């Protein structure tokens, strides 16, 4: 059930540590992690990020993931609510 | 599927006044976040070849067929 995020930010630190990554984030954050092929999951963590927004001061780091682990980190410039 | 969303995504630029904030030139990542075999092929593209730079990615987050967030590029990270 959405909670597996805490599961998934696990995979996503031995990447950032582990495959030297933390190089390329920011030294304060908001991360937002997003499960592709997981909807009941990423639709809760967009949910988070949405009540629950700050920007600057701890921009947002979104990491998509695919088959339980990331692909790509969109490092954040700006955010616009549609 | 995509190509339908693209097009409900322009009304919202559009009559909805979004383009405002939305580069001169990009190229759009339109991200379903509710349909899995069309969010993936859609990533599947954004992999494909633009280079280091180029044209900046926008990327137009999903839910319910209705675009709920924009997200504007400032850097982008590979993992594999």
């Given at each position: 059930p959405a909670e597996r995020l805490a599961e998934l930010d696990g995979v996503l630190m031995q990447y950032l540590l582990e495959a030297d990554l933390?190089?390329?984030?920011?030294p304060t954050y908001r991360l937002v992690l997003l499960p592709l092929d997981e909807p009941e999951v990423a639709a809760q963590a967009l949910a988070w990020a949405m009540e629950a927004p700050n920007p600057e001061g701890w921009p947002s780091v979104y990491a998509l993931f695919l088959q339980g682990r990331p692909i790509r980190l969109l490092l954040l410039g700006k955010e616009v609510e549609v």
């Open positions: 933390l190089r390329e984030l920011p």
